[model samples]
Target: ATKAVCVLKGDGPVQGIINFEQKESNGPVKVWGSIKGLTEGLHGFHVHEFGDNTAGCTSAGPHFNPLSRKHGGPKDEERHVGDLGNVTADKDGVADVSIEDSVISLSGDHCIIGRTLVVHEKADDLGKGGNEESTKTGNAGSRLACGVIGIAQ
Candidate 1:
C-alpha cells in the first residue's frame, strides 16, 4: 500500500486523504502517508469497521473491534479486533506510525479501507484501564483526532 493521509486534530477533525495499495497479495501492506498537522503526543492509531470517507471519517466509528471484545491494546490478544495500539505524535504535531499486522489486509479478515483511524487524547493500556491504562483508550481518553483510510487500488 502506498502512503495514506491520517489527518488529525483536536475536536472532530478531518485527516488528509492518501493512496493505499497492497501489491504483494501476501506481503506487507506498505504505507507511505504523512500525518502532518496534528496534536503532538501519543494517540490512538486504528483501522475502524467501515469505509465512509464521504462522512469525513466519522462515518467509521470506534476502531474496528469486530471481535465484540472490550477495547484494548493491539498485543493484548484479548483486545478488540480493531485494537491497533498507540500512535505517537511528534513535537510538531506530526504522527508517523505504520503497521504490518497479520490481521490487517486488503484481501483478508478485517480489511481497513472502509474503516477509520483515530487519535486519542490519552494512551492505550491494553485495556488495563487506569491512570496507566485509561479505559477510554486502554484509557487514552477522548477521541482527540481522527481520519478514515480510503481505497486507492
Candidate 2:
C-alpha cells in the first residue's frame, strides 16, 4: 500500500489535515480529512499541479490536469483527475471528508505525490454552472487553503 498526507494552512483561520491511501499501485485513492473555519456549506477540494506555496495558494497553479480535460464532478468521465468535488462544512464550521476516487492515483504516470491539495472558498458547481469558468474551474471561487502532498510513514 501507498500512503500520503497533507497539512492545510491559509491566511485566515482555515486549517486541516488530509490523508491519502491506495491499496494497489493502479487502484483508486482513498481520501479522508477534516477541515475547520469554513462557512456552513460545500467547498471545492482539488489536487493542484504545483506544490509551491511561495505566493500562498495562488502559487499552487491550476488543477492537476495533465490530461487537459474539462472540469467536472468526481464521477464524471470527462473530469480532470484532480477534481475530487466538494466537502461540506457543518454549522460548527468543520468539514469531515471521506472520498474514494478512482481517477486519482498515488503512483504511476498520474501520481499526485509532491503536488498540492487546495480547499476553495465556494462550492464547486461540478462543471454544470453553464459558463466557461464552470468548465474550467467549476466556479469554485477563491482558494482558501492549500498544502503539499508528502509521503507518509
Candidate 3:
C-alpha cells in the first residue's frame, strides 16, 4: 500500500496513531486517526511544516502553509495546505477522525509524507474568528499531541 503514518505524543499523557492512505497514484489522501485523553469537544488537527521531534512537539514548527495563505478548513480554497479543520472527541476523551482531502497528496507539491501531524488543544476558527492568531494558526491552542509523518512499508 502507498501510505503514511504518524504516532503522536504529547507533553503529559496524550497519545494517538494517525494513518494516511491513498489507493491510487496522486489521488486524494484518506486521513484516519484515533487519539485519546483529549478534552471533550472540538480540537484543531493539522499537518505541520516540520517532522523534527527531537525537542518533542515544540520542534514540529507551525502548520504546513507552503502557499502562504491564511488558516481555514480543509475545504477552503484559500487556506493553508495543512489546514485540516477540527476533530471532535467523545466524553470518553477518544477522538476518531476520518476524512478525505483532495488538497493533500502523498507526493508532489502538496505532499505531506515527511512533515508532522499535530492535534491542538483548542478548536480552530477556520479564519472566521477575527483575530491575528486566527489568520495564522486559526487560534488553535498549544500542541497536545504531535507525530512525524513517515512513508509506509
Taking all chains together, each candidate's TM-score versus the true structure is: 0.70, 0.98, 0.96
lDDT of 3 by residue, 50-71 (tens): 9888898888888898988888
Scored by lDDT, model 3 comes in at: 0.89
Q: List model 2 lDDT by residue over 10-116, tens digit each.
A: 99899999999998888988899899999999999999999999999999999999999999999999898899999999999899999999898999878999999
What is residue 121's positional error in candidate 2, in angstroms?
0.6
* Candidate 3 Cα errors over 4 Å, as ranges: none
Q: Which pairs clash inside model 3?
A: none
- Reference-based TM-score, model 1: 0.70
Ranking of predictions according to lDDT: 2, 3, 1
- The candidate scoring highest on TM-score is 2
Candidate 2 colliding pairs, count: 0
Tens-digit lDDT track of model 1 for 21-43: 57666455654455655677766
Best by lDDT: 2
Report residue 121 deviation for candidate 3 (angstroms).
0.5
